[PDB]
Paper text:
Nsp5 is a 33 kDa cysteine protease, also known as main protease (Mpro), or 3C-like protease (3CLpro). Mpro of [name]-[name]-2 produces 12 functional proteins that mediate viral replication and transcription and are highly conserved among several common coronaviruses. The active pocket of Mpro is located between domains I and II and is characterized as a non-canonical duplex of cysteine 145 and histidine 41 (Cys145 and His41) with four binding sites, S1′, S1, S2, and S4. The [name]-[name]-2 Mpro [name] mutant possesses a single amino acid substitution in the residue located near the Mpro active site and has been identified in Alpha, Beta, Gamma, Delta, and Omicron variants as well as recently emerged Omicron XBB subvariants, as documented in the Global Initiative on Sharing All Influenza Data (GISAID).
The complex crystal structure of Mpro-[name]-PF-07321332 was resolved at 2.07 Å resolution. Unlike shikonin, PF-07321332 can be found in both protomers of Mpro-[name]. PF-07321332 occupies subsites S1, S2, and S4 of [name]-[name]-2 Mpro [name]. The electron density map shows that the nitrile carbon of PF-07321332 forms a C-S covalent bond with the S atom of Cys145, which is the Mpro-[name] catalytic residue. The lactam ring of PF-07321332 can be successfully inserted into the S1 subsite of Mpro [name]. The oxygen of the lactam ring forms a hydrogen bond with residue Leu167. Additionally, the oxygen and nitrogen atoms in the trifluoroacetamide of PF-07321332 also have hydrogen bonding interactions with Glu166. In summary, PF-07321332 occupies the active site of Mpro [name] through covalent binding to Cys145 and hydrogen bonding interaction with several conserved residues. The Mpro [name] mutant loses the hydrogen bond with the two water molecules that formed to stabilize PF-07321332 in wild-type Mpro-PF-07321332 structure. The results showed that PF-07321332 had a potent inhibitory effect against [name]-[name]-2 Mpro [name] with an IC50 of 9.531 μM.
Numbering used by the authors:
A (entry chain B): 3 to 300
B (entry chain A): 4 to 298
The structure:
């Protein structure tokens, strides 16, 4: 059971390089618009507390250099939507996929296409943490890289990368420029809140363990949502809702293990540990697989 | 994070190959489709297939090749070790710059898992020392390929053929020669005992020092032989002088001598992590190569 990213070719064909003055990052080129983080119009001097409304009025089309591989794109218009810059360009991308912009919830997963200088570098699978950060791998120049899901040739863009927090986790917006989490696009002191484990994803991962070989952690017992939720808080675990139980229903129906019975397994694992046994070859409990992820893979 | 390569250059080469009732994936490069030769097997042939006798009875029109909605015309065919090479009517217009390479255990690569010719997911892999892949491959995944990409040239190194009973996977290079002692035949065969890729753990430890963690270092050193005598008690691969030379650059960039990093690994194996993590893991990661670390 591997963590898998979506195939990235539909997105690779949209990545471009955006340069404003001395600042270069990545942009997303869909039809005749290029989307990128608005802090590209910041001068490094003004990363501390910029006024984006003012800095953009003073910009003109000629302040933006957009490069698609070998080819320079001519910017013919610019505007802002929340924290993303929208650069209208000369040419529609002939590789534009069927796509939509969506906003995801903490605990959902997506693929990230990490890019540098407009050129795709690698792909990995991520989860939006309960504290609204991403445990990604982003280096200098990675801003504007996007995250996405694919459903039957339709790309759902859900994330654009903006910044790294002092604990090495990452923060970004949806493609309409709304931040995930209580962060702002400026170099001021900010930090991730204390993170928590995504309970519904651990359970889904335990179902995947049962779907494969592993069954030793099953027991005769069952809990209640209220009794399990007291256990969850003690171990820094997101509380489990009736909504989570309902979505795990398919896996509970397929494997014959009710969710509150799996919770009994999980509560038991959280207290007594694994006693030298493993689950899908892992010694810790994995929480970056959603229920849909497990159904899809299996 | 362990990252796969962007998969688009390979997605444009995946096709569907059908022969009778068997369908799997093929790789379409220029005017040749490559795929596993057991596409020409039926039910009653998996146990003891005679591939020469099965192939002699086929003609070009027995092979149905589909690239998306378009049927390709097969105009020739031949067998090279355990891969079939289907000469087609049309050169793939999306053929990337590519080459074929055979890799060694410990090497990493990306896998594009496909079903019925359409890409489903991409993940990053290592060739294990027992010549198997710890992959994620379902019923129709055969013919999925593994690859690296360097300066826009795609190095194809793996094509998927079989699942072993332990859940791991075996396959061939793109010339059809199996990695390890496996055969494309449904008989009792089993992966040998697997071991940890020691040179990859050490390279990763060097990556931890470079990103500013040093908690696992100690003041000891070790001889190469003493290191290997301890490490093999944990099912770690022996470290060779070639591996030592290979880590040299990282040892220079960090100032930590290779054998001093070996002493730290012996201690990590002795103690565990005591609830800590090194890069982002509570496990010793062995699927990032020395070459990977510098990049
Ligand atoms: C880490 C740093 C101290 C530099 C800063 N962090 C914080 O200001 C915080 F602590 F508030 F998060 C930060 O990321 N930025 C400062 C400045 C932009 C952003 C930035 O340079 N983004 C990079 C875009 N290519 C990607 C970064 C590069 C390192 N790894 C990444 O992912 C803006 C928030 C406007
Ligand atoms: C797992 C099974 C017991 C069926 C068998 N294994 C062994 O015979 C062994 F144990 F000896 F390896 C096995 O894999 N095959 C039997 C037959 C082909 C191959 C096969 O069906 N390949 C699939 C290609 N689409 C991919 C497989 C599907 C399951 N998961 C995969 O990855 C050949 C070896 C000629």
């Amino acid at each position: 059971f591997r963590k898998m990213a979506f195939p990235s070719g539909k997105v690779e064909g949209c990545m471009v390089q955006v340069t404003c003055g001395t600042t270069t990052l990545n942009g997303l080129w869909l039809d005749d618009v290029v989307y990128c983080p608005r802090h590209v119009i910041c001068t490094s001097e003004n990363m501390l507390n910029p006024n984006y409304e003012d800095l953009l009025i003073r910009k003109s089309n000629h302040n933006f250099l957009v490069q698609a591989g070998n080819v320079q794109l001519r910017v013919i218009g610019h505007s802002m939507q929340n924290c993303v810059l929208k650069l209208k360009v000369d040419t529609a991308n002939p590789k534009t996929p069927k796509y939509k912009f969506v906003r995801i919830q903490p605990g959902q997963t997506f693929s990230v296409l990490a890019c540098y200088n407009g050129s795709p570098s690698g792909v990995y699978q991520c989860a939006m943490r309960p504290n609204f950060t991403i445990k990604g791998s982003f280096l200098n120049g990675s801003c504007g890289s996007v995250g996405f899901n694919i459903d039957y040739d339709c790309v759902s863009f859900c994330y654009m990368h903006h910044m790294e927090l002092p604990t090495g986790v990452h923060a970004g917006t949806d493609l309409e420029g709304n931040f995930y989490g209580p962060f702002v696009d400026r170099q001021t002191a900010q930090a991730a809140g204390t993170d928590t484990t995504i309970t519904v994803n651990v359970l889904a991962w335990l179902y995947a363990a049962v779907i494969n070989g592993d069954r030793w952690f099953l027991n005769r017992f069952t809990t209640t949502l209220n009794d399990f939720n007291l256990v969850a808080m003690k171990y820094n675990y997101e509380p489990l809702t009736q909504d989570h139980v309902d979505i795990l229903g398919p896996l509970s129906a397929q494997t014959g293990i009710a969710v509150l019975d799996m919770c009994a397994s999980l509560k038991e694992l959280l207290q007594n540990g694994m006693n030298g046994r493993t689950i899908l070859g892992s010694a810790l409990l994995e929480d970056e697989f959603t229920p849909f992820d497990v159904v899809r893979q299996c």
